[PDB]
Design a protein around this ligand. Structure first.
Ligand SMILES: [Cu+2]
Ligand SMILES: [Cu+2]
Length: 286
């Protein structure tokens, strides 16, 4: 309840400067790379093998997986700078703008801007511009630059709306069998965005483009964590609202998806991260 995750737009220039600096440090130290690989590994871990579901996506573990993932990242920032916490990108408000790409999150002192269509959508502004920040491909080999291409996709010309987010918060069950991308009247499948996809979470990735367009390379873009911080806030808000609801499946789901299963690549369980306050953080909106 001490660490407070703030909205990006409420950040002081110094806070924004300190977040970036710490992320750059994690990168230099070789720590940042551990996160990208954990994510890649996870999406490759199929539950069960042959199934669509994996440890980190397309099933019930989606929400807790990333919560643990973000918890570990924040602790790592914290080891560098005890004053630094993970902010969130409230994409639903930016979506209200005439031109969302005009959001302050993309300023040169923070995330940097859109991709340069002359350099194949390589990002050349900001702290994470090519030549300042090295990227890795799916194979673990250098890929040579952050790429972004906002709203370029026919399927996802726009970010998700405030109404889209409110409509997910109305769903009663955390998830429903068969605990996959076809799960109906499920908050998890809804938020993840497979209901008439891409919506919500999935929709943000498609809208951002570049590495953020494809799962395995998503975290190469530091905006990945800001986005997942916002996703985690929505879940946390749901938990407050539907407080007689609990995680599902409690059992009989596939191994890795149940309440008390370890979440590959770690030993952490969904039970372990069910209460975010217990983890030592809370979002501003409280
Ligand atoms: Cu993920
Ligand atoms: Cu994601």
């Amino acid at each position: 309840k001490y660490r407070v995750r703030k909205n990006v737009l409420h950040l002081t220039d110094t806070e924004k400067r300190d977040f970036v600096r710490t992320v750059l440090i994690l990168k230099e130290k070789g720590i940042y790379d551990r996160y990208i690989a954990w994510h890649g590994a996870a999406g490759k871990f199929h539950t069960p093998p042959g199934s669509d579901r994996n440890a980190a996506h397309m099933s019930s573990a989606f929400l807790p997986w990333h919560r643990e993932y973000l918890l570990r990242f924040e602790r790592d920032l914290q080891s560098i700078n005890p004053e630094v916490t993970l902010p969130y990108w409230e994409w639903e408000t930016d979506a209200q703008m005439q031109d969302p790409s005009q959001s302050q999150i993309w300023s040169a002192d923070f995330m940097g801007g859109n991709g340069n269509p002359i350099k194949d959508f390589i990002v050349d502004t900001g702290p994470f511009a090519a030549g300042r920040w090295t990227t890795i491909d799916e194979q673990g080999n250098p890929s040579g630059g952050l790429k972004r291409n906002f709203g370029a996709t026919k399927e996802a010309p726009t970010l998700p709306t405030r109404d889209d987010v409110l409509n997910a918060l109305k769903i009663t069950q955390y998830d429903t069998p068969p605990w996959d991308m076809t799960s109906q009247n499920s908050f998890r499948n809804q938020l993840e965005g497979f209901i008439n996809g891409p919506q919500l979470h999935n929709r943000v990735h498609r809208w951002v483009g570049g590495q953020m367009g494809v799962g395995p390379t998503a975290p190469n873009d530091p905006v990945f964590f800001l986005h997942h911080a916002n996703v985690d806030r929505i879940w946390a808000v749901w938990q407050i609202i539907h407080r007689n609801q609990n995680y599902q499946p409690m059992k009989n789901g596939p191994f890795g998806q149940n309440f008390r299963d370890p979440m590959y690549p770690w030993n952490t369980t969904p039970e372990d991260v069910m209460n975010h306050r217990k983890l030592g953080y809370v979002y501003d909106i409280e």
